[PDB]
Design a protein around this ligand. Sequence first.
Ligand code: ZN
Length: 262
Amino acid sequence: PSSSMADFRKFFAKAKHIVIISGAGVSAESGVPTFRGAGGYWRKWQAQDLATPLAFAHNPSRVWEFYHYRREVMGSKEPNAGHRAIAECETRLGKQGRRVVVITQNIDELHRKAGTKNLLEIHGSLFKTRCTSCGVVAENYKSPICPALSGKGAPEPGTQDASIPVEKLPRCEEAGCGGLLRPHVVWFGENLDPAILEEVDRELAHCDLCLVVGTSSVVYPAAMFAPQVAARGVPVAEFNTETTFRFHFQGPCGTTLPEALA
Ligand SMILES: [Zn+2]
């Protein structure tokens, strides 16, 4: 797999429909905790313990504390140079009639905060709710999302459950509903939204260039997407911090992407 930036730039100059698959590395470069890897814990748990329907079912207060913490944490985080290079790329090429689309597993909206408009959030967002009764999806940036969660969600091991009664957790504000909100995020063991998958598949089908950033082409979720793009003969360029498709560029996305997408 080539590491010739100058060859990649020749493809990039000619591309009219770029798909950018964005993974967790792009978020880790902004200091966003993932609660996934080795060492990534919230109290005594990781994401696979709390990001589950069963966990929300048994202890919705605890799960909301976890997600409340992740929302409020975002007030001190910023998009990095990788985010910015990707958004600036969409803006510039859009003025030329050229399409850029970002397909991300990240739920922290730093791509949006950087200015990306063409964004497919395949795991949802920290800043969207979904009513477990009526299914309405709504934007929610309120700090705190409800009064009972003010000051809750502390991550230190040893923090006690807030044990908020389900009635004082975030409730649906649709007239005549009032059901219990959940985070509008895809949990472990859950289906992706099929309308999103359909949109993903149309982009993968039409693109002439595909970028995989901050993750590996060989693992979920990019493994779902890059191979069928590569199968059609479309070049795929990987930007991650591994030591090993047409291109692989080693390093933080914030270092390589500004040059690659200039
Ligand atoms: Zn509702």
